[PDB]
Amino acid sequence: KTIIKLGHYNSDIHPSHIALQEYFKKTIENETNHKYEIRLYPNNQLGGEDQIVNGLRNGTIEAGITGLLLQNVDPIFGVWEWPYLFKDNQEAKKVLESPIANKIGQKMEKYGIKLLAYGMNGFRVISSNKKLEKFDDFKGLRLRVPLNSLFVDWAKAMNINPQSMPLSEVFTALEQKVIDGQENPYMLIKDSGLYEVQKYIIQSNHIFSPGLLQISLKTWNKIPKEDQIIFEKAAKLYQEKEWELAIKTELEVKDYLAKHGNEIIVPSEAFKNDMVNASKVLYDSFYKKYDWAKDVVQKINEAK
Ligand SMILES: O=C(O)[C@@H](O)[C@@H](O)[C@H](O)[C@@H](O)CO
**CATH number assigned to the domain comprising residue 136:** 3.40.190.170
**Could you tell me if 229 and 102 are in contact, meaning their C-beta atoms sit under 8 angstroms apart?**
no
Nearest atom (ligand 1) to Cα of 209: 11
**Ligand 1 pocket residue status of 49, Cβ below 6 Å:** yes
Distance CA 170, CA 188 (A): 12
Residue 303, SS3? helix
Q: Record the resolution, in angstroms.
A: 1.6
Distance CA 230, CA 65 (A): 19
**Ligand 1 pocket residue status of 68, Cβ below 6 Å:** yes
Domain encompassing residue 228: 1-304
CA of 71 to the centre of ligand 1 (A): 11
Distance CA 223, CA 205 (A): 39
Sign of CA dihedral 151, 99, 243, 265: positive
Nearest atom (ligand 1) to Cα of 49: 7
**Ligand 1 pocket residue status of 81, Cβ below 6 Å:** yes
Amino acid making up residue 226: E
Which residue's CA lies nearest to atom 7 of ligand 1? 146
**Could you tell me if 147 and 51 are in contact, meaning their C-beta atoms sit under 8 angstroms apart?**
no
Length of the chain: 304
Distance CA 61, CA 115 (A): 14
Buried b (16+ CB within 10 A) or exposed e, 165-179: bbbeebeebbeeeeb
**Ligand 1 pocket residue status of 212, Cβ below 6 Å:** no
- Going by their DSSP bridges, the two strands 208-216 and 113-128 should be labelled as antiparallel
Which residue from 252, 271, 278, 240 is spatially nearest to 93, judged by alpha carbons?
240
The DSSP symbol for 197 reads G
Which residue's CA lies nearest to atom 9 of ligand 1? 67
Which residue from 157, 128, 151, 150 is spatially nearest to 141, judged by alpha carbons?
128
Q: How many domains does the chain have?
A: 1
| HEC per residue, 70-139 | HHHCCHHHHHHHCCCCCCCHHHHHHHHCCHHHHHHHHHHHHHCEEEEEEEEEEEEEEEECCCCCCHHHHC
Beta bridge mates, 38: 4
**Could you tell me if 72 and 149 are in contact, meaning their C-beta atoms sit under 8 angstroms apart?**
yes
**Ligand 1 pocket residue status of 70, Cβ below 6 Å:** no
**Ligand 1 pocket residue status of 119, Cβ below 6 Å:** no
Sign of CA dihedral 20, 26, 32, 37: positive
All residues at 6 or more sequence positions from 158 whose CB lies less than 8 Å from its CB, including other chains? 135, 138, 275, 278, 279
Amino acid making up residue 167: L
**Could you tell me if 11 and 21 are in contact, meaning their C-beta atoms sit under 8 angstroms apart?**
no
CA of 303 to the centre of ligand 1 (A): 24
CA of 119 to the centre of ligand 1 (A): 14
Residue in 14, 53, 65, 68 to alter for ligand 1 test, most ligand atoms within 8 A of Cβ = 68
**Ligand 1 pocket residue status of 170, Cβ below 6 Å:** no
Sign of CA dihedral 64, 65, 69, 71: positive
Cα 84-212-6 angle, rounded to 5 deg: 150
Contacts of 96-101 spanning 24+ positions with Cβ under 8 A? 96/210, 98/299, 98/300, 98/303, 99/299, 99/303, 100/296, 100/299, 100/300, 100/303, 101/303
